Amino acid sequence: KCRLHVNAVFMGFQRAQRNQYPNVALLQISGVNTKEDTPFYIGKRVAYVYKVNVKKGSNKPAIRAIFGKIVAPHGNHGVVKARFLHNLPPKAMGQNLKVFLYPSNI
Amino acid sequence: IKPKIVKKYTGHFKRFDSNRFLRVKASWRVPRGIDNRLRRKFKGTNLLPKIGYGSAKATRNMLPCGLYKFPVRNTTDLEMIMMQNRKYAAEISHAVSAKKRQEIIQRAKILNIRVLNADARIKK
Amino acid sequence: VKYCAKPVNVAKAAQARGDNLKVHFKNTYETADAIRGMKVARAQEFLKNVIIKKEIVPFRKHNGGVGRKAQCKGLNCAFGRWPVKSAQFILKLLKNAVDNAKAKGLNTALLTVSHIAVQEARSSRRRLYRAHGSINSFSSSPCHIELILTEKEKK
Amino acid sequence: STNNKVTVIDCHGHVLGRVASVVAKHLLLGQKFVLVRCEDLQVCGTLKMRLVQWELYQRKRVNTNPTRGAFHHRSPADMVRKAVRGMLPKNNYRGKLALKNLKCFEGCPAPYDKMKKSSIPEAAAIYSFNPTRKRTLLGELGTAVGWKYADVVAKNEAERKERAAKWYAAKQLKQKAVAEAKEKILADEKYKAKVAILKKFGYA
Amino acid sequence: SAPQWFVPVKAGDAKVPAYYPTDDMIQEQKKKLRTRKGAKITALDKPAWNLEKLRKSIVPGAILIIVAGKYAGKKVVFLKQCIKSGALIVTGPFKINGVPLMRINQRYVIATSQKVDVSKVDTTGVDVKFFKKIAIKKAAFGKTVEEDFAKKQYEAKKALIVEKQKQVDESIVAEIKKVPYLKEYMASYFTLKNGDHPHLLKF
RNA sequence: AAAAUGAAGACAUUUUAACGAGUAAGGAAACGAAAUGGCGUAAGGACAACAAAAGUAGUAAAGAUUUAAAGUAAUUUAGAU
RNA sequence: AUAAACAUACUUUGAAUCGGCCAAGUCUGGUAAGCAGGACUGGCGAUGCGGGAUGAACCGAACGUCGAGAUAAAGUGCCAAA
RNA sequence: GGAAAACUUAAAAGAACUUUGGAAAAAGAGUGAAAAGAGCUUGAAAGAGUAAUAUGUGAACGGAUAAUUUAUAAGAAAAAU
After folding, report:
1. Given an 8 Å threshold on Cβ–Cβ distance, is E107 in contact with A103?
2. φ, ψ dihedrals at B37, nearest 5°
3. Using an 8 Å Cβ cutoff, are E95 and E186 in contact?
4. Which of A9, D91, D196, E130 is the most buried (most CB within 10 A)?
5. Which nucleotide in the DNA or RNA is closest to residue C118, CA to C1'?
6. From the centroid of its chain, how far is CA C92?
């Protein structure tokens, strides 16, 4: 109906050269090209909506979501840190997430 | 009321090389080799039982229902926990016959004690 | 020796078995795998072509040194042989089971080979006199065979 | 959402390595790329130096079996795929999937010849190069090493330029009439209320 | 007296010890679970202590964009704040948007600069009593089963009061039509087109 | 380690503070504020329904296969066959 | 001057060990050696972790089980976080 | 010089008649509390066979983190004055 979100790319987890900490996920919000535009998005909602091909004998929904929040910037290029209720599956790397306009402060 | 029972490690501490050889069982044994990959705590293989893994003293040995297990062999052994039915749960031993099980199961209902083997050796 | 599986409806099944059969396990294990699931009439035709070397038995698992043949196209196996002795033994058990079905009163034209399983048996030892004053073992490879025929019905 | 549209990169007047590095990173970010005219990319060094580097590259080869050895692709569309594949993860599903969304062509083929082309400013040869430094088109180097289809491409590109010449001329005629027709609506008095709104915000 | 840990229960003629009283003198007590006290009911005028502080941009008569929930993207007019819940009582005038009278928490709205003001909106009712009156509750647990048709009849019954209380729309609708293009603005969804980056979007 | 409490609760008490890597090697048992804490195999002497029929067992023991639970771990417990 | 009461002084009984190896704003024999032998200290042996692509010794820093942050050596075109 | 090899059941009641097969045997039938069926109490691991399920480019296995599927699994009380 209407677009009320900004597409964000799940680049990967907060890691080191030979380590990886899947508790914090890194996102690239479309339109943020510097760390001085991130303060708007600190605290906004983020959802990882995905589709599962359920069977006709299951009541499990075909559309599910994992929700989280943006907590801090990550480097001088407008990359963010997002903490989710359940850590995103690494099979979802490079996929698109939703950055909502709420909880609004405007 | 029931406290939040927190476990620091829900897996099992398997023996080293237990997955590769069938003569080495899965029961844990600290490796005492001079070149052992595990006892030297390498990257990847550095999982050993330590005292720090122990769970909280408040909730130790507590069943998920929130009560402590208490084995009983007869109806008389139930009377030892009838004052503490909010702390202990009965447990009919594995060798107790089906006849003696009905008396234990019935009596615990009279004394308001939770039995965890209430569905054991039930007839056809 | 018991049976690996029991039929769903004992009233519509027939059984036959052989214990300590003096036939190679690896040859009879591969033959039995070929006739699994086909109708009794088709199976008896397949086992007869194998005897006169007109249809192949694909040796799928035990194919070390087994030569390639022209009849093994379409079976995803490049190797096959024509074990006669194992084919004959199964032919006698398939006949025995069919006579058991007829006595029960089942329609032979409807039966299929639903279950057929081969298991290893106790071997017999013999001497092979090698060089430098040695003796080796010259051991048989017998097997047990179980057969169950059940009528095919829609589900 | 899902990125189904394809980013088209016009590899004309770009640097081979700097295009690959930006393309390789964004392949891991789920984007779909199609680099057309991958034969017009430029590399540093004259033709003689490029041949010395190529001859050294051709040396690496499995001694006991050259058919197992390194395969030295000579088509420029394969000189960019090799460059991009070097910058992507090796021997995992993440690397294979990222490379599955990449294509070079030696020109603009049928579906990608009428698509919105993009550019990578970091990889532009006019920014990263001293103008006096001598370069080499990947197509010119390909011919010197055995790429047979260099003159087939030059024929196809020539017919693409001439077909876009008539489409652009016809489009420029229509767009001029549409622009002049709009100026009459702007000057019209019935649309005075709407025009004032546009003038207020500078759109007019 | 009985010990604190002794709650005698009836025995179905089964064997009992000597000390256990016979059931003819045993009276059962209904099992009790709840122990906390529900919220006290106060004056309709006085506000609850748990009252959120509204942002300075949200003032009565403003036009808000709902960015979450069922009416995501719709535009509503902010009448007043529910003192008993801290939620905003907004009406996205039903004759224009189709958004009825409802309570929405202040974190799911954006306070635009555009204002319709409108005093004399006749908010005599429209409070905790009204919203609790028209809310569609479930059929509880022991109150039979009553599937399917139970929810439909609730809406039919609450429809007459829900429609009646929408009389608040009479004046704001008139003021909305006064400003040019304002009717279209509210009647349409709010969408993020290409190039509208929220960190740059100002309303 | 130091304070407080202490015939029996219990989780080998309560509080505060500092500390915890490790081959060869050492720290036997007992020791109420316990001079390290525990698991398992087998046999011997006791204890095991306190009101004169007193641990379990043909209403299915030991053993075997697995499913779950408790324990950091050694292991223990229970269900099904 | 500074530090030191879980400080200090120990007594008894006893285990393992005395094949060592490396570094260097060090030395001796040797053309020289990843050679042979020494003075002082630190390490490896007995030692994992982050970095140097990989490495017994190099640099940072020594380890009960976890969460959140500020860091160290060193890095920020892609593989690879910046 | 110098071994190996214990156990059906309470009782042989150790199938006994029919069909297929050259025969051994098999399928019915019958005994017995139960085939425990004589290679006979129970019947592990290594090795196989059948069925169900799932996976795949020059090893396989292990660990941390999530997703999918399956399994386990938490309730009968009830507000203000």
Report:
1. yes
2. -65, -30
3. no
4. A9
5. H49
6. 11
Q: What is the largest CA-CA distance in chain E?
A: 92
Alpha-carbon distance values, E104 to D81, E65, E101 (Å): 54, 11, 10
Question: How many degrees, rounded to 5, is the angle at CA B26 between CA B25 and CA B27?
Answer: 95
Distance E186 CA to G49 C1' (A): 61
Contact check, Cβ <8 Å, A11/D29: yes
CB contact under 8 A, E107 and A3: no
Query: Which pairs with CB-CB distance under 8 Å and at least 24 residues apart come from D94-100?
Result: D94/A93, D94/D28, D97/A94, D98/A94, D98/D24, D98/D27, D98/D28, D99/D27
Pairwise CA distance, residues D19 & D39, whole Å: 13
What beta strand segments (E) does chain D contain?
A: 7-10, 33-36, 42-44, 117-118, 135-137
Query: What is the Cα–Cα distance from C102 to C97, expressed in whole angstroms?
Result: 9
Nearest partner of A93 among E149, C32, D98, D190, judged by Cα: D98
Say whether residue E149 is in contact with chain B using an 8 A CB cutoff: no
Q: How many CB atoms are located within 10 Å of the residue C30 CB?
A: 25
Tell me whether residues E9 and B103 touch, CB distance under 8 A. Answer: no
Nominal resolution (angstroms): 3.0
Strand H nucleotides where any atom sits below 7 Å of a protein CB: 19-21, 23-28, 36, 39, 45-51, 57-58, 60-70, 76-81
Residues of A engaging D, defined by a Cβ cutoff of 8 Å: 7, 9, 11, 28, 93-96
Q: Which subunits sit against A, judged by 3+ Cβ pairs under 8 A?
A: D, E
Straight-line distance from the first to the last Cα atom of chain E, in angstroms, rounded to the nearest whole number: 72
Residue E168 DSSP label: G
Instruction: Determine the Cα–Cα distance for residues C39 and C47; give it in Å rounded to an integer.
Output: 12
Cα gap A12→A19, rounded to integer Å: 12
CA distance E112 to chain B (A): 45
Please choose, from the candidates E103, E113, E99, the residue with its C-alpha nearest in 3D space to the C-alpha of residue E80: E103
Euclidean distance between CA atoms D128 and D14, whole angstroms: 10
Q: Please indicate whether, in this complex, the C-beta atoms of D29 and A96 are within 8 angstroms of each other.
A: no
∠ CA A69-D92-B17, rounded to 5°: 95
| B residues 53-92 lying closer than 8 A (beta carbon) to E | 82-86
The burial class, CB within 10 Å (0-12 / 13-18 / 19+), for E177 is exposed
**Contact residues for E173 (Cβ-Cβ < 8 A; gap 6+):** E93, E95, E96
